[PDB]
Ligand binder design. Structure first.
Ligand SMILES: *c1nc(C)nc(N)c1C
Length: 362
């Protein structure tokens, strides 16, 4: 018996995840072989021979209604009480749990220590009041000037549009029915344009030819820009500098915010020939032990990945050695937090949004 598995591809160090999963799997099932494969939910559906895999929850509704996944009954979920409540709830559809939460993500406002004025900023308009508009298109921005932020790519901008709308309306929704692309929401568009105005056009739309997703974090640590909005994982790349930066959650408006989080969940193929064994592996990949092992440094010169876990036990175990995880645990335990979900017609809607958003954003 060989199981085909795919870990989440977009992390600072996927090799650390692959080694943690293999190590933990072998402790319970040394005879069942694992064949690790490359798979991305943003540009592909689940292959028929891919047994276990990790996906971004915006695609969960589509996969469920298409008959691709195998639901997890209550007796198929290990230590459900340790999993953050909002994360567990965001993994349900048609009354069933369709995925096991592994990683969570959210943009944060990074500023340098000593710069107390930015420490008080709570939303993008207050940020604009402090740093103002960019006055250069150079890449990267001048030393200690402007905002660093990745807004390159269609789905990123489409995602940002939909998260902002929920803040504008002040009511959470899983978007079972996606919104009209014609009468576009003005408040949301003005907000997205403010971010571009603060960061510069070319700098905000830049894509490195080597595909380094954490390049803006390296520019910030070197002295570029005054503020940087990016995921928590950006800190692994900062390395030694991670201790010198400060960070806090930032809203796209003055209101109720409703903190939204991207959630990467572990699911099982409805077509798998090994249902219980597959469910056993899904639990291992999402267990507190393998996630802690994947986030911790595994060789000399290595730094923590700084990814957000979905179980309480991981934050507790990483805290002593890495005090940064204490502030991340606090952000993640807010009562109002929610998982970012999109309707069953995501793919088509994304195609349509690509023909109208760039023009609206200038
Ligand atoms: C979290 N959030 C996003 C949007 N993308 C990645 N890769 C992660 C880990």
């Amino acid at each position: 018996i060989t199981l085909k598995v795919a870990i989440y591809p977009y992390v600072p160090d996927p090799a650390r995840f692959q080694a943690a999963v293999l190590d933990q799997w072998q402790r319970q099932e040394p005879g069942v072989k694992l064949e690790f494969t490359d798979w991305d939910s943003y540009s592909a559906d689940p292959p028929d021979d891919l047994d276990v895999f990790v996906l971004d929850s915006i695609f969960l509704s589509h996969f469920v209604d298409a008959g691709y996944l195998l639901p997890f009954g209550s007796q198929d979920i290990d230590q459900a009480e340790d999993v953050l409540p909002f994360a567990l709830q965001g993994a349900k559809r048609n009354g069933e749990v369709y995925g096991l939460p592994q990683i969570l993500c959210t943009n944060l406002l990074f500023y340098r220590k000593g710069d107390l004025k930015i420490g008080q900023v709570d939303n993008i308009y207050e940020l604009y009041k402090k740093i103002g508009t960019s006055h250069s298109e150079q890449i990267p921005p001048p030393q200690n000037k402007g905002l660093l932020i990745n807004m390159a790519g269609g789905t990123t901008k489409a995602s940002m549009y939909l998260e902002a709308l929920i803040d504008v309306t002040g009511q959470y929704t899983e978007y079972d029915l996606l919104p009209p692309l014609d009468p576009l929401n003005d408040k949301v568009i003005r907000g997205l344009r403010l971010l571009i105005n603060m960061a510069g056009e070319k700098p905000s739309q830049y894509v490195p030819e080597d595909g380094d997703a954490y390049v803006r974090a390296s520019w910030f640590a070197q002295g570029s820009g005054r503020a940087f909005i990016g995921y928590s994982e950006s800190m692994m790349r900062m390395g030694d500098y991670a201790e010198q930066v400060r960070f806090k959650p930032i809203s796209s408006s003055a209101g109720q915010d409703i903190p939204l989080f991207y959630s990467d969940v572990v699911s099982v193929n409805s077509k798998t020939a090994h249902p219980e064994l597959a469910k056993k592996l899904a639990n291992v990949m999402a267990s507190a032990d393998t996630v802690e092992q994947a986030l911790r440094p595994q060789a000399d010169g290595q730094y923590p990945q700084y990814l957000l876990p979905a179980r309480h036990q991981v934050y507790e175990a990483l805290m002593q050695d890495y005090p940064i995880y204490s502030e991340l645990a606090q952000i993640v335990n807010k009562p109002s937090n929610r998982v970012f979900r999109l309707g069953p017609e995501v793919r088509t809607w994304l195609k349509d949004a690509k023909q109208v958003l760039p023009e609206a954003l200038g």
